[PDB]
Amino acid sequence: SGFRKMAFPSGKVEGCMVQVTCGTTTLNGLWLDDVVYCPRHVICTSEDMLNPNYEDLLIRKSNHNFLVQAGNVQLRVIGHSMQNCVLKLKVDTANPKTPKYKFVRIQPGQTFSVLACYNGSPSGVYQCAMRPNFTIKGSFLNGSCGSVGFNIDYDCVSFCYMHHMELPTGVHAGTDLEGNFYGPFVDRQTAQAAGTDTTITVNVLAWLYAAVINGDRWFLNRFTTTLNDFNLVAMKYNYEPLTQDHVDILGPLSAQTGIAVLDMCASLKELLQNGMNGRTILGSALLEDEFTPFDVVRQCSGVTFQ
Amino acid sequence: SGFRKMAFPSGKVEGCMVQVTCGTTTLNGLWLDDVVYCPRHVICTSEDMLNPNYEDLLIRKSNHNFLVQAGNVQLRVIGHSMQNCVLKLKVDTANPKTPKYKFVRIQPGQTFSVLACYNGSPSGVYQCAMRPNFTIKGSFLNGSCGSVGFNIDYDCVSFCYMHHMELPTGVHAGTDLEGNFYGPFVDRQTAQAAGTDTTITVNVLAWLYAAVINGDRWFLNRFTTTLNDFNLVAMKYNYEPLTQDHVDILGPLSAQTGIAVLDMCASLKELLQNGMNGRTILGSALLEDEFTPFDVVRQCSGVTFQ
Ligand SMILES: [Zn+2]
Ligand SMILES: [Zn+2]
């Protein structure tokens, strides 16, 4: 038994990370096949950050300059393209460690693992959720830009995230691997504005089933209802609304535990107005929303096949 | 910025894990140089678990039998020794992926990363603490036995833990890599008895400094005291006592924040009788004790050098 916020093993990603340097500046990058992917503000000089014209910043940039390192080997950049907010470089040598990779643009609420890197080397791995306002509540210091987020459900690596900014509010924003920001943000070191961050209802419910599976009963009470009375409470407390689409996703956990999705909503209803709050569930005094129904199945049972 | 319970990157350990099978049964094992290390109850048959005589169970065991696998390659066990509660096998091929490794017997309160594995392959990675009663509150299902815990502070892998039992109470117990159990436990599927699990005071304080560093001030109050009045409260609430040895360990964080260890104890005093408890610190409503002072420095700043 047990329940932990676990990350995917990072081995396959560690062999893809490089130290990228241009003009001066230096940050992390992602070496697949023979292309390096990295944030485009790698080419930005300081005052540039406050108001950059990337097209003009870069049309100057030396090819044959962006300096790329990797342990005891430095990659001779040939040449260069800018895709949206990333730069792609078509360097001299191809990563023998490129695994089956793909690219994904996940949607708010999905979870992924982040390999935080400095000076191109691994620092740590943690499991995080894309918020409904398209931010991440992360852990990144100077030089972590270019660190990526990923899944290896099976057959490896769905790259889904690349870190770019720390917002003035302390939250983190970035792009998919074709350079499209998640959310209303730019790579400008200027005033921004993220949504209201709401709690991911479907994940909270998956977490309640994981608790029942692990011996947490106390909050299963003798009520229930359908999901307009729930939804009409779940949003005064700013929880995203539950749809029949979320209900279908929870089915297997319902079949596991013999507990109807709707009856679980009932105790969640009361937990908002009475229950939670210090007797803890799975050792926490808050309701946690960084597990998908899929994370609960993978872990807790469905942990064999990659 | 940010604060996350992060694990060490697991790449260097993933290449050390094998699927081990004997009599029947099958569990995880650890391939370094050309020796496999695994729990000795690998050789145990079912009824055996309830009352095993390992010396007699094994003196029978076929050499030339323990079956070991690894992707598309199976290792031809030569032969075999039992060290305390592990078996060491001196197999036919040597792991080209053995990195600088060492062995450590960490002490209660230290933290490490666990790579949970099934059928010899990676499943997930999480960051955990050895409790003062020498248990771990983990996440392990059937077949995870042989999964290891490790650090890679720098120059890689201090192996410190190998999983053996799930206690009837739901907690996990295991050994160091020479087979010496942590705590009062045996590899017998019988009645046991773990200590009272107390909160790791020094870690809680490190976590408070991490919070101050990340913009949590509210709990710094205008009190203080020396550490007999603290210790005399910290143990009614069953926190291990704070020593001058813990004080010295916190110095750098004191020098970082300009906050004396003793003044931080003061707010911790009050938090026990008034403060904590729903306005959260670093987004939690409980006091967390799974960060060492060293984890706070590594992360949050001291993240460069391996
Ligand atoms: Zn940057
Ligand atoms: Zn076992």
Swiss-Prot record, chains A, B:
From the UniProt record, list the coiled-coil ranges: none
In UniProt terms, what is the effect of altering N142A? Does not affect ability to cleave and inactivate human TRMT1
Which residue intervals define the domain Peptidase C30 in the entry?
Answer: 1-306
Name the source's superkingdom. Viruses
Q: Where is the active site?
A: H41, C145
Q: What is the effect of changing C145A?
A: Complete loss of 3C-like proteinase nsp5 cleavage
Residues assigned to the Cytoplasmic compartment are 1-306
The molecule here is called 3C-like proteinase nsp5
What species does this protein belong to? Severe acute respiratory syndrome coronavirus 2 (2019-nCoV)
Tell me the organism's taxonomic lineage. Viruses, Riboviria, Orthornavirae, Pisuviricota, Pisoniviricetes
Q: Which residues of the full protein are shown?
A: 3264 to 3569 of 7096
